[PDB]
Design a protein. Sequence first.
Lengths: 525, 524, 522
Amino acid sequence: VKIESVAIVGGGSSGWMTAAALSKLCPQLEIALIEDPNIVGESTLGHFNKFLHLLDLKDEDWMPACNATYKNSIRFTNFREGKGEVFEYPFGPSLDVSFFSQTDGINTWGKLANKYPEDFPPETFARFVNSNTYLAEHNRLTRNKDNKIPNFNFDWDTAYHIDAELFGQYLKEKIALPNGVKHIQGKVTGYQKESPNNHNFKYIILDQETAIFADLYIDCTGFKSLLLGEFMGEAFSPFSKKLANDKAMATRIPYENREEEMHNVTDCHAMKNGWVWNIPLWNRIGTGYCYSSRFVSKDDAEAEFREHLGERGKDAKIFHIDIGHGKRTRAWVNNCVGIGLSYGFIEPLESTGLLTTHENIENLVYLINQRDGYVTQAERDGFNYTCDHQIDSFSDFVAMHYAYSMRTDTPYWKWCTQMCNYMPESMGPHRQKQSTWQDLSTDTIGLNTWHINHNGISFIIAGHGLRPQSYDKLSEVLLKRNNESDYYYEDIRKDWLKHYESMVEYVKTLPTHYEFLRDEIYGSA
Amino acid sequence: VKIESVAIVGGGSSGWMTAAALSKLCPQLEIALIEDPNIVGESTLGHFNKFLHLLDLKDEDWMPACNATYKNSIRFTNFREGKGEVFEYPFGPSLDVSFFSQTDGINTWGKLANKYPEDFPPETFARFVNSNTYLAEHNRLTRNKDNKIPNFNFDWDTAYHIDAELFGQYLKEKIALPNGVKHIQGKVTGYQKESPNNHNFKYIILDQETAIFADLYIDCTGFKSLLLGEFMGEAFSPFSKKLANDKAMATRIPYENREEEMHNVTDCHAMKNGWVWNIPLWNRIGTGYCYSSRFVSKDDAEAEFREHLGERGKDAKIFHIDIGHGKRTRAWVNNCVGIGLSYGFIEPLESTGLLTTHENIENLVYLINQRDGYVTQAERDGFNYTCDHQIDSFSDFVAMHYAYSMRTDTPYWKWCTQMCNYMPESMGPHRQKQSTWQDLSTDTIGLNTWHINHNGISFIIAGHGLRPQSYDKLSEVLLKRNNESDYYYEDIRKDWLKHYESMVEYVKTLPTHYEFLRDEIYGS
Amino acid sequence: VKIESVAIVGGGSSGWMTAAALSKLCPQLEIALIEDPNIKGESTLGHFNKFLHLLDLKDEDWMPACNATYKNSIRFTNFREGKGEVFEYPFGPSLDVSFFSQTDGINTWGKLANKYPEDFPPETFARFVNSNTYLAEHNRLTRNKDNKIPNFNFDWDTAYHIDAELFGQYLKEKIALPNGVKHIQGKVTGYQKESPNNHNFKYIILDQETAIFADLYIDCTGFKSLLLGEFMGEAFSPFSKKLANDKAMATRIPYENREEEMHNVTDCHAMKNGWVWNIPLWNRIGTGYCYSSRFVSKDDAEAEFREHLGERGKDAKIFHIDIGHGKRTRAWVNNCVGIGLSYGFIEPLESTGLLTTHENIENLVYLINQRDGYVTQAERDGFNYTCDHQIDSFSDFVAMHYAYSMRTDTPYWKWCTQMCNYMPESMGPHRQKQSTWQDLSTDTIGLNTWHINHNGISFIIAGHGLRPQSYDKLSEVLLKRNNESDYYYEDIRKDWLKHYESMVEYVKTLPTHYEFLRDEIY
């Protein structure tokens, strides 16, 4: 019954991330990884820091081995109104409450925005609640030893841009192979079930000859989903009802001015039929268009993409990917687990690429270390529920980036903002597992308030130009009960504007992203 | 593309309340109101104070222009047992915790009721948690300068009896027209959609000739629901599964003793097949029967109503109204929004008449002021959810007034209390959006407790003669674990009974409702 | 119109428990109990103490009248791994927080288990959070006058093993009959509804002759469910989707060494196709096999059971019962209420036998004392909701005892642990009324935490060898955010191990269960 041996099929980031984690955190396991000899930049979340910490990986050691750079924020260019306007979702555990009204809490920024519009445009919300914003905005970095950047923790509030394949190659050479992971070179061609009615793999077939025996098979074969989707036949739920993007093209561009260009951030540039990601690495920029075939041809999207990239557009080698934008109905089916794109994928607008991967890895390590590799159907059902809940949460969050945009300038954006219904279940009599659309609507229109329970939504709807109270006369009328006054907002305004001007001056004395990497991590170029 | 111009169809309270609010709080809007030249008293909630404050309306200015009087409570005569018994739902932000046991909180009154029944009949719950109750009970009023009436704020804890048509006429002359609302006299006869697939109104037609162009059309046509219901074809969900009342008749009665009769309160008198509202105005009493055609004829209901009104019943002119007791499945459909009875209506047992109106107005003003009139489908879906949730909440609350009655003396009351199932979805496997029936049942029978989360339910089930713990031996047994004691209830009893006797004495030194109105608002 | 008179059909524990409660707490009621002359041991919860306290019943008076003994814990032998391993669910109002990390709360024991495995095996969770555990473990009892056993209250944290029939006979003679409950000897043969459309009983028929008139009819007829199930036709929802056990056999075994054997606890011994209960009474041990006919024959289950009982297995008289393992879709239908097995039943793995009974009795007493016997449809619908919610909760809790076992040694245990899907609704878009499976899965795999909201689940999954954080490196990494340290766990370990060794020494000076009963009760 017990999982004693594991066969991982696939050797990308997902394969070696799984092999490394299992080899280090589950030493009781015998592990093999099957990789086909005969066969690109990505940004991470805060979540990634937990994975790195669990594997004892120091920035100094692994970052140079995969052209990694630092990431302090996701930047949204052209998303609100399609006129080059910018807003950040900076990394942070919690909103800095330092300049908040005692009585208005999180709603303080919105009242400032109503009273003093010229001083508090949408891009000021992030600055007003998160100082990581300043590092991102002026492309600077610091370990913040003396806490001179408020409520910023370098280790945990800074994530990474990585070459995922080289990251895998690092985990392979340094963690997996040394810990006795058996590297098997071969193509998985077929499988044998245990019996007509027992749908567990008895073994999988390598090169139409060799049978690989394992207690648990892990599918790290990406969009193919060879073991979970094909062999075990698990259905695929697409996200096409709230997310229109079903295609991606990707490319590598050389740096023109490497020091200036190697940004502290993943930029997301909204286009006519989707958005383009910008991922600075040590040696190059990784960039791609996520678009909707519903609204644009492959040829038209590529002409768009090249035009958008300028001179570096013309000779850029572009690779088209068919993206499984959705999830399998289950991650763990019989004696096979989907880890990475074999299970699920959200377009990386919230740098969610590796989420499907390290979440499932940590949840697998959790169950295997529970009772020496013994697991019940109840726990596997729990694994499926936990990781299903998560990808549904994140897919709704990503959908909100489109839903609240002001853009109606193309049929794509007219669909996203004016036609698509994001709350179809909301008029029914039953409470939804995924109810953030309903709850946000209640809090904003119903109660005229934000809440720290919006962890992330607040930065997105702020950047799209929404406020908890849309007009000041509304705020005024709520003070009238207990004969209160807003005059102290004049002091919050003056004091904060002063704090901003001096915070920018201090942040300009800090090393640039490139300088920090050169001096602290690389020691070179 | 953004809402720059608005066409409101319908005058009345709803039409002019919408025109005034939009004209003042959304100055960027071009506004027109279409009213058909060829064509009553009602009570408000606390909610109404927010509306008045948003429009800067001072009591001195608007009250005399629409025969308005003050309202401190909803009074329920004849609802528990059908024997003239009375209980109040007084206005208040929160339950006054002053005489509550630290350990029993809200359940203090119930334990007093069990221990000292003669001293704590059902009508004492309201007195014990809200002092506004005393103003309502002795027909007195005060601005409470020095806070000598505990936890009462005159501005916000006092609502109003108004003539709704004259209130609209005030908003028209003083706010809407001055702020450039374009008054168009005409009958809306038809409409033209934008295209085969675009179901937005391209324009609406006036007198089968003139096309009115607007970015957004607001339906204030009342029960007709001409734009939302008829033209946009939005379905109607009736409340007939929990609320039986589908008819109203209404009348105007002259005062016999105006000073004595012009009450601080909306009285709701339960009858054989529904209930009669009493709304004191400056110059008259507004009164009507809400009834169920399922259980009584129009002529039987009218004979009932006239008998109930006494001598003034005989010559009273009575106007019969067909009430759309329910909601459209959506308020905002394409480029048309329902505001008022065009969207929804709950019989005014909880003075909820204007709720469907000022809630939707405030939620519309909120979205229009967000990004200069630009709104997403997500926000309109949010608007529909918010205002649907609210009318479902309030319709359940109103249903609870019937459900928990002791009355089984007519087939109507036998249906309300013994036959109607108010919790049909509750035995299924899924959690309901509307779960107050389920939650109250769990709190009372399951956990033997009330909660401040029952904001309002507590006054109603208290008045119907329910307690969180139905018998004292139950309370006794829960203290027995850690050898704890109730002896201090003797002191809560004596101290409170003293506080009541002296509170009535103070309240009797205050001006009467009529005196207050005469001296502070009118000057007759 | 209001409940003035009540007819209880059935005279077991359920019948007389109902008659006694109503007669004492609802004096306004006229009460009759109909019992069939030709119709001829169980453990309780803490909740039973509330019932006893409501009826003013002192241990000294009622315990000897029904061969009652004391019960401080449910013990689970052979349930984790099928190798004689034991863990307790001891009685307690709350988890004792005395040795908990301020920052880790309930997760403290789990971190100790990871750091110091040899010192904190699964059986130590109960010891670490509940001292009642020590009384149960060393078969001792005390009134704890000086609170020398932390967070233990003798009156409320000690329940009972009772002969349920003799308990009913006591309530009959001492409370019900003296309070004027009218005892009617007869077989209920039929009924007449009020009209085509009014489905209320107008009366029920006794011996095909006599009509019994009552405002409210209470069905205490057990699995028969004559009034609720048969006459009112209320459907039965079985629990076979989560609980495989559909059969029970039961027996009486004499004591070999009564002093040593008369345990402080209900033992639940997991077998090949179910589990055997051990209920010590004053004069005998009551014992039975709950099993699944799906996985084992009646003859095979009985051979199993006799073998398990040893020498006194061979001559033991065994009584086979067909158990209605489920609930009626409603308890209160028209003017008839199901109380006891007529409404619902969970196999007594969580000593839940009397739950279906005293909870419905207390909920009925609650509504009747509200407005002098007047009740609305809303209140009756509320009664149905409350008592439906409860039996669904408890049936899920009982299912968790199987679901999380390590046993795969028979097809029965392979089914319970590796095949049965306990969370079928969980992948849907709607939130479930019953979502403890979903919420426990989220708390453990999702958030790597336990919660006091698991009141009881924690003892079961702890005993099955599960931890909130499964490995220590995971704990380490979560401290790293807010620069926190675990150093102080060395002191929690040493301090607690000291407290345990001295707690065992003190508990050994206390009287044994038998000594306590002999000196205090008999």
